[PDB]
Amino acid sequence: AGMFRALFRQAVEDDRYGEFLDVLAEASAFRPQFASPEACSERLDPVLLAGGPTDRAEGRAVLVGCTGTAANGGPHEFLRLSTSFQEERDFLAVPLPGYGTALLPADLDTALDAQARAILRAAGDAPVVLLGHSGGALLAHELAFRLERAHGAPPAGIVLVDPYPPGHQEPIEVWSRQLGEGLFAGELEPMSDARLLAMGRYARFLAGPRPGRSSAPVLLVRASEPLGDWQEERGDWRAHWDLPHTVADVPGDHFTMMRDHAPAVAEAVLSWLDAIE
Amino acid sequence: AGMFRALFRQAVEDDRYGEFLDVLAEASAFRPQFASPEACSERLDPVLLAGGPTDRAEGRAVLVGCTGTAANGGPHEFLRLSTSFQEERDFLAVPLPGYGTALLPADLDTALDAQARAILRAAGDAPVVLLGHSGGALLAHELAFRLERAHGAPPAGIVLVDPYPPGHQEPIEVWSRQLGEGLFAGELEPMSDARLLAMGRYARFLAGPRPGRSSAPVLLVRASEPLGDWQEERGDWRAHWDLPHTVADVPGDHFTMMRDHAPAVAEAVLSWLDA
Numbered sequence A: 001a002g003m004f005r006a007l008f009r010q011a012v013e014d015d016r017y018g019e020f021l022d023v024l025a026e027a028s029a030f031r032p033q034f035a036s037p038e039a040c041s042e043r044l045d046p047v048l049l050a051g052g053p054t055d056r057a058e059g060r061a062v063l064v065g066c067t068g069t070a071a072n073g074g075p076h077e078f079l080r081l082s083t084s085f086q087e088e089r090d091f092l093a094v095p096l097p098g099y100g101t102a103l104l105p106a107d108l109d110t111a112l113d114a115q116a117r118a119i120l121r122a123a124g125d126a127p128v129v130l131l132g133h134s135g136g137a138l139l140a141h142e143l144a145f146r147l148e149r150a151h152g153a154p155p156a157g158i159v160l161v162d163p164y165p166p167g168h169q170e171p172i173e174v175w176s177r178q179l180g181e182g183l184f185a186g187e188l189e190p191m192s193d194a195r196l197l198a199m200g201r202y203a204r205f206l207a208g209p210r211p212g213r214s215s216a217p218v219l220l221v222r223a224s225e226p227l228g229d230w231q232e233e234r235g236d237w238r239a240h241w242d243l244p245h246t247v248a249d250v251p252g253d254h255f256t257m258m259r260d261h262a263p264a265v266a267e268a269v270l271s272w273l274d275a276i277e
Numbered sequence B: 001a002g003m004f005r006a007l008f009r010q011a012v013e014d015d016r017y018g019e020f021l022d023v024l025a026e027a028s029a030f031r032p033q034f035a036s037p038e039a040c041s042e043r044l045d046p047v048l049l050a051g052g053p054t055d056r057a058e059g060r061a062v063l064v065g066c067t068g069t070a071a072n073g074g075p076h077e078f079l080r081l082s083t084s085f086q087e088e089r090d091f092l093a094v095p096l097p098g099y100g101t102a103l104l105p106a107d108l109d110t111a112l113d114a115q116a117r118a119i120l121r122a123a124g125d126a127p128v129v130l131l132g133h134s135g136g137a138l139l140a141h142e143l144a145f146r147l148e149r150a151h152g153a154p155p156a157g158i159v160l161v162d163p164y165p166p167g168h169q170e171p172i173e174v175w176s177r178q179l180g181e182g183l184f185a186g187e188l189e190p191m192s193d194a195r196l197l198a199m200g201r202y203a204r205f206l207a208g209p210r211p212g213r214s215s216a217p218v219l220l221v222r223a224s225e226p227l228g229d230w231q232e233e234r235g236d237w238r239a240h241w242d243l244p245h246t247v248a249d250v251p252g253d254h255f256t257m258m259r260d261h262a263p264a265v266a267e268a269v270l271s272w273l274d275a
Helices: A003-013 A017-028 A079-085 A108-123 A135-151 A170-174 A176-185 A193-207 A262-276 B003-013 B017-028 B079-085 B108-123 B135-150 B176-184 B193-207 B262-273
Strands: A047-050 A062-066 A091-094 A128-133 A157-161 A218-223 A246-250 B047-050 B062-066 B091-094 B128-133 B157-161 B218-223 B246-250
Touching: A003 A017, A003 A176, A003 A193, A003 B003, A003 B017, A003 B193, A017 A176, A017 A193, A017 B017, A047 A079, A062 A079, A062 A108, A062 A135, A079 A091, A079 A262, A091 A108, A108 A135, A108 A193, A128 A135, A135 A157, A135 A193, A157 A262, A170 A176, A193 B003, A218 A262, A246 A262, B003 B017, B003 B176, B003 B193, B017 B176, B017 B193, B047 B079, B062 B079, B062 B108, B062 B135, B079 B091, B079 B262, B091 B108, B108 B135, B108 B193, B128 B135, B135 B157, B135 B193, B157 B262, B218 B262, B246 B262
Parallel strands: A062 A091, A062 A128, A128 A157, A157 A218, A218 A246, B062 B091, B062 B128, B128 B157, B157 B218, B218 B246
Antiparallel strands: A047 A091, B047 B091
16 A cells, blocks of 8 residues: 555554654645635534434433544444443544545644534534543544634533543653554554544644643543553553543553443443433 | 655645655655665666777776666666767666665665675776766765775766755755656656655755765766746856866756757767866
8 A cells, every 4th residue: 555554564663653653744734735614625424323312312411422533543433332322322423534535634723613513513402522532532622622612612521531631641652662553453454645644643733732621521531451561660651631520440451441341431421421410 | 646746746836845855855764774785675787878989998988877866767867868978988877776665775875885886897997987967966976985985996087967066056946846847747657655755865865964075077067047037146056066177068957958958968078088
């Protein structure tokens, strides 16, 4: 396939994941982009992946999965987790613009507006709870705030699954290689060069200074097993968020928490939603 | 039709050739390489593109064309020019390593060594005169110095056709778009991503500090028409070299000098060699 994928595979083998992510971000600058939400390529129509109880569909929060940055991801991302929401809550997955041709966002705000427009449309008057994993968790928070500040519509809550925000993603750097190896282990097919570019541009967006903090209550869900050797003399390897409303620990690592242990993620969510309501 | 060429196509459209060359150099670091000239993956056998007079078979210097960095280039770079050397001089084109899964050179010196070894094998006991055009002209000079100091075989002369050496080469930066546009026109086929990366890597080698000067006399051949617009204000737009043996001006621009007007470049070389 593409040269970017082959270069990345080598960088990962050489333990230079971070360096190549910078190269992707620089190269993404030369892709055509959209400078206004209404100029976005794709239909950002959210897909219904689970349906809540018909007896009670009116006043209850609906869940919206915020697709993460992984170049190997897309519509498969919340398949496993969503199953556990069937007959409990509507679960809607919103695509991240610029993936599976597609113009890349000029800046993050522009992408977030396009998602906001599409989520408000599908959700209607139901309160929204945003959910994301890993970089998708950082995206879920930036979206929540944008919704509050730019659209005057704060979500009723945010579920952040293993967020590593700037100021404390040191374990994520030490686990760099395992992170890169995890991208390759997860491909159902070769990651396209265009999607690697989109990943690099978003990673760069997410490293930048974004001081807006959402007023929505946060559930912080954390992996219980380390992805790699750590050694706690350095401090905590675990995911972090400032002042969470509730924290739930679940089995598995940064990656396995979302597959084999997805039901435990779902159970903490459902239980947190009942309390909040 | 890989992504690097599509990005490069867009960069040239947006007048950002310089910036994108930097991205190619950066990305090139992640391609497999060779650290020793012996580890070079390809055969750098020079190809004979013109033959000298069957008559005289004495000393007689042999022209060695040092292929440039163009990702759309290769064995066809000197075809037009060499025609004018037929029945005058042997003309040999040496390939530039890393083009045509070819390992890229870890640094410039490693590439010049692999070239120096193949040139010596071909040139036998004859004197060698390097010739290069534009970035190939810079390469020709860096190779001459490498031949002289690391192979104990100093060339008998160097022809630098429209060179724009670092730190004092601005017009070629201002004519950026025209170069990128020139790469696309003239592609016999789509430039591969591996060759674009090779081009980026050499470009960066050639922007770097290289004090070593060759002892061989230089013929500086300069284009007569500007490639693009240029304010009569500050600056001669012309190619340049420090203290050349002879300077020769020929019709055409940076590009056409090697095409329609190649015979004029050839005339200048023959005359100069005759001394």
